[PDB]
Subunit: 226 residues, 3 copies
């Protein structure tokens, strides 16, 4: 029941208790620049290196910009793209500041291709909900995700709280099997990221509640010790 | 007791129930062009990426042709060749002349080097039998393979049934721990491969009986997803 | 329990019983040119490929020379260096001047960066002790290593017995959880390394006591057959 994300360069696998449980819905919630995307990227790279397939749906980067970003963190994924191991889905209308309102959530729920992979990542699910133009609500979306995670797949969304009402956020949080909140904070001269695991159903072992890190060129996530 | 063949790009590991059991003798039987070789190639690449060693004995491709063929599927194995992780054995006399005759089976049974690896592939064992010139028979060869798989090694052979009488094929099939039959078929005017698992002793878990695939440039085996989530 | 060192190209993992136990202190003791370094290099490459992190502290090679040496063995570690997965520490004063003297052992015990990794390699610990100018003695160093291995880390040191008195060597040996002695010997006019496992606490399974190898271009450690299947 544990999906592995192990890399030589960090011990994030130990701090989440060994791996990510199959059937997890992970919500990563935090404001801009608090490290949500990089976290998704580290997790995606971990999975892909451990022979899992990943769908990565980005409301922010074209395929090109993603390849550069991953390459910049030394999480390069060119071979994985070529084989289809990594299915990257740029949401052009949200990338392009035309930003048009659309049945995003219907598309998300109805595109079979995404869910053939082991792991499906929506960075940002908050932008997709906030720009949806339909009677599909969040309870429906959450129910749908629960159905997919019941197949032992893993879903990971980022949420920026500043672009959704509290009413909606509270529902996403309840649905989460794993809820992580990201922030920035400063100690000594240093800005750092903190990822706090507010909730972790099926927690596969003892895990660290507060994970401090920084994002480093040509490393990615550098986790700070203890 | 399970040898892993996992790759990111497909879920073939799930469909064979998790992996290939140690001590397996896998027979892949089908006519020309039904995908036997590509299947051996996918398995070999999986084993190698999961830190197993492989010997691949080919009656069809020189080393050069093999490297290209592996590269064409994006199963490139250059580094594995250089380290000796992959030992590739072209059978030149059959490659140079389809019907050249010789003590192929004696060579197969006697070359130590092949059996130092975890997995040994003969593509085609049917060509090596059909062109053997000796008193070594199939029962002897099978008994020898059984002796090697008893050491926890894995052996994989392809068989073209056009090359051997039914009397012989029946023996091989009996000896197989895993028997897979390949064919081509067309649905929606598209041509596809089917690998059907007719027998699977020591099946390590629930597995798919019919595995449909197509061979795709720079992917290799694209396995058709049978269920829609 | 078991740290994996598996590579497709050899079966070292089977000969050490499956892997290296977490919390091991491995001492590799032998004279110059008996293969201690190459063995550390094989182990380091094994760990790195199996998703552990490694610190490699060398009294002999600059970073550049290490990259060339690794590349020469087909154990190339360029990407692991760039990510910090591999932290390589050249001890410049010993590299630049064979017998320069200093508080080496203070620097070793104090530098927290080294011990953030899963596996820490000192090649050579005997040079660092022999040229230390401090109070610090071997029992202290051993006690410090024991504390770190109690955190499930693995520590690996090479020892040239020509550099230290027998009094200090006997302490390191009794303190080792895994003790391996290396020598050269010649068979068929060919010179080979032998690594003998004199002691193996927490041995995770059946293991081979004698491991013969030669160092081969683009292979590294080429382990010889124990047994012919």
């Amino acid at each position: 029941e544990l999906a592995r994300i192990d890399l030589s360069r960090d011990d994030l696998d130990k701090r989440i208790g060994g791996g990510i449980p199959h059937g997890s819905l992970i919500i990563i919630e935090g404001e801009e620049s608090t490290g949500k995307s990089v976290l998704c990227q580290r997790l995606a790279y971990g999975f892909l290196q451990n022979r899992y397939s990943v769908t990565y749906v980005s409301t922010q980067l074209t395929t090109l910009e993603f390849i550069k970003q991953m390459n910049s963190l030394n999480y390069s994924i060119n071979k994985k793209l070529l084989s289809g191991a990594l299915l990257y889905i740029p949401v052009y209308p949200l990338i392009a500041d035309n930003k048009k309102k659309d049945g995003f959530l219907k598309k998300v729920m109805e595109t079979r291709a995404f869910y053939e992979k082991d792991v499906i990542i929506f960075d940002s699910i908050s932008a997709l909900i906030a720009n949806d133009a339909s009677e599909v609500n969040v309870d429906d979306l959450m129910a749908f995700f629960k159905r997919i995670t019941a197949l032992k797949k893993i879903i990971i969304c980022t949420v920026n709280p500043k672009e959704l009402p509290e009413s909606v956020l509270t529902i996403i949080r309840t649905s989460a099997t794993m809820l992580i909140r990201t922030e920035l904070f400063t100690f000594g001269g240093d800005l750092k990221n903190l990822a706090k695991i507010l909730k972790y159903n099926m927690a596969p072992g003892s895990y660290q509640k507060n994970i401090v890190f920084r994002v480093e060129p040509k490393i990615g996530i550098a986790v700070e010790i203890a």
